[PDB]
């Protein structure tokens, strides 16, 4: 089954998931000089005050911090979005080295990592139904660079020992996702897909311009995770990112002048 290695990685995905070569695949390169300021964009609203995290899971490709989405708690609205999208989970993509790891790129620049906060549209009642709709999902993409530590990330960093291998999970209640945001909410937005199989072209991407900084020791701990399950040969969880995909004359719009 799909992974990130030579034999099961991004170049192989299209065989099981034909949509890998579809018309709105993610991620993409954000060419800053081609993106246009869109004044019809309403202000973005990230409301994570009442967020209810439940647990953290190593799924053999990344780790997901999962949220209780059975009520309108953590929500994304405004910006390019109509209506209300509920936070369901977040996860990261990172590299083996600082000079790679992000999925989206900016003028071809790769960040050390990329955080994806995944939200589903509430007109569709649940996640599984949302992912059958062209406007079912909204993903908030935040770049990570290596610099000073991100305090709001350390509770995640502390728990990764508990979930080293594929299939392991740990209690992860009372996590506040607001600690992972940068100061500015300036963003690029384009219509796209999930970046892991089954891919699925149901995402409104909202990619933040301002990266967060995380410490070298924080990202180092991401890199100690395993792709394999307990009692198997060690396959370090690194370079779990899909590279940039053809834009196919979609338009990337900027929230900012
Ligand atoms: C292609 N296509 C369509 C379906 C395709 C399709 C399937 N249909 C169901 C897709 C369900 C996906 C679930 C969510 N996936 C995530 O990854 C979310 C996490 C995540 C979030 C964000 C990020 S990130 N990186 O932040 O972005 C990264 C990860 C497949 C399997 C379905 C199963 N089912 C139902 C059951 C049930 C029980 C057991 C086993 C299964 C399997 C798994 C077999 C596999 C082959 C492709 C449809 C919708 C018909 C469609 C319409 C129009 C055009 C095309 C098209
Ligand atoms: Hg879709
Ligand atoms: Zn992702």
Number of helical elements: 4
Bound molecules: the ligand CN1/C(=C\CC2=C(NCCCCCCNC(=O)CCc3ccc(S(N)(=O)=O)cc3)/C(=C\C=C3\N(C)c4ccccc4C3(C)C)CCC2)C(C)(C)c2ccccc21, mercury (II) ion, zinc ion
Major beta-sheet overview: 13 strands, mixed
Helix vs. strand class: mainly beta
- The amount of beta strand, in percent, is 25-35%
CATH class: Alpha Beta
Quantity of strands, as a count: 15
Ends: how far apart?
Answer: 44 Å
The helix-strand sequence is: HEEEEEEEEEHEHEEEEHE
**CATH level-four homologous superfamily name:** Alpha carbonic anhydrase
Shape: globular
CATH second-level architecture: Roll
Radius of gyration: 17 Å
- Domain count, please report it: 1
- Any idea of the CATH topology? Carbonic Anhydrase II
**Proportion of residues in helical segments:** under 10%
Main location: cytoplasm
GO molecular function, one term: arylesterase activity
Subcellular location: Cytoplasm; Cell membrane
Protein name: Carbonic anhydrase 2
Which secondary structure elements does this structure contain, and how are they paired or packed?
Elements lengths: L12 H4 L12 E2 L5 E2 L6 E4 L5 E6 L4 E5 L7 E4 L6 E10 L10 E2 L6 E9 L5 H4 L6 E10 L7 H6 L9 E3 L15 E6 L10 E6 L3 E3 L1 H7 L30 E2 L3
Parallel strand pairs: 1-8, 2-15, 10-13, 10-14
Antiparallel strand pairs: 3-6, 4-5, 4-11, 5-7, 6-7, 7-9, 9-10, 12-13, 12-15
Zinc ion binds next to strand 7.
PDB class: lyase/lyase inhibitor
Keywords: Carbonic anhydrase, NIR moiety, inhibitors, LYASE-LYASE INHIBITOR complex
Assembly: monomeric
General description of the model:
There is one protein chain. The protein is mainly beta and 257 residues long. The protein has one domain: Alpha carbonic anhydrase (Carbonic Anhydrase II, Roll), CATH 3.10.200.10. Helices cover 8% and strands 29% of the residues. It contains 4 helices and 15 strands. It has helices spanning 13-16, 127-130, 154-159, 216-222, and strands spanning 29-30, 36-37, 44-47, 53-58, 63-67, 75-78, 85-94, 105-106, 113-121, 137-146, 169-171, 187-192, 203-208, 212-214, 253-254. The strands form 2 sheets. Strands 2, 3, 4, 5, 6, 7, 9, 10, 11, 12, 13, 14 and 15 form a 13-stranded mixed beta sheet that branches. A two-stranded parallel ribbon has the order 1-8. The longest helix has 7 residues, at 216-222. The chain starts with 12 loop residues before the first helix and ends with a strand. The structure holds the ligand CN1/C(=C\CC2=C(NCCCCCCNC(=O)CCc3ccc(S(N)(=O)=O)cc3)/C(=C\C=C3\N(C)c4ccccc4C3(C)C)CCC2)C(C)(C)c2ccccc21, mercury (II) ion (HG) and zinc ion. Mercury (II) ion binds at residues 133-134, 136, 200-202.
